[PDB]
């Protein structure tokens, strides 16, 4: 039993829901949240600008630091860092970008790190604006995660289009 409230079960492991996932980590404070990053971690828009915003640049100095030691990484790659006042951890994972001509292919990869982490709470890779279809997004996702994922999607039309079209 986990603290996560209103969620619609779509398989075993994976649950969704319409919702700001800023506002959801603050209150349930999980273990790990994700976020929607890119290589060099520059959280500038997005999921990722906006869970920036709510650490008060936190995470985007934690990220700076973290790239001078380490370089880039990799499309599909992820690194832990800290969750600030928004979780234990973020899981900070890179989901090919269509916009700037990415591997869609890559999109598996990116779930499979969600699988080193019992629970989390997280967006659908590559949607928004880096530009890949979300129902394709949820379809790897349920295919990819064996662990318990709790899905948080910010658009009440798109949110009701993905239940909707679940197969
Ligand atoms: C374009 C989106 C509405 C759809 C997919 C992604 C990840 O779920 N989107 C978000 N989903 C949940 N919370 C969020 N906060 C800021 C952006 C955001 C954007």
Request: net charge neutral; hydrophobic share 40%.
């Amino acid at each position: 039993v986990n603290s996560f409230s209103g969620y619609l079960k779509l398989t075993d492991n994976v649950y969704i829901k319409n919702a700001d996932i800023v506002e959801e980590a603050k209150k349930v404070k999980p273990t790990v949240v994700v976020n929607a990053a890119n290589v060099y971690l520059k959280h500038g828009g997005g999921v990722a600008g906006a869970l920036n915003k709510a650490t008060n640049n936190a995470m985007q100095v934690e990220s700076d630091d973290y790239i001078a030691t380490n370089g880039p990484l990799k499309v599909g790659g992820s690194c832990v860092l800290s969750g600030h006042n928004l979780a234990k951890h973020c899981l900070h994972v890179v989901g090919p970008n269509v916009n700037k001509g990415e591997d869609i292919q890559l999109l598996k990869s990116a779930y499979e790190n969600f699988n080193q982490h019992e629970v989390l709470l997280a967006p659908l890779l590559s949607a928004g604006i880096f530009g890949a279809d979300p129902i394709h997004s949820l379809r790897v996702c349920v295919d990819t995660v064996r662990t318990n994922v709790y899905l948080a999607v910010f658009d009440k039309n798109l949110y009701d289009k993905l239940v909707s079209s679940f197969l």
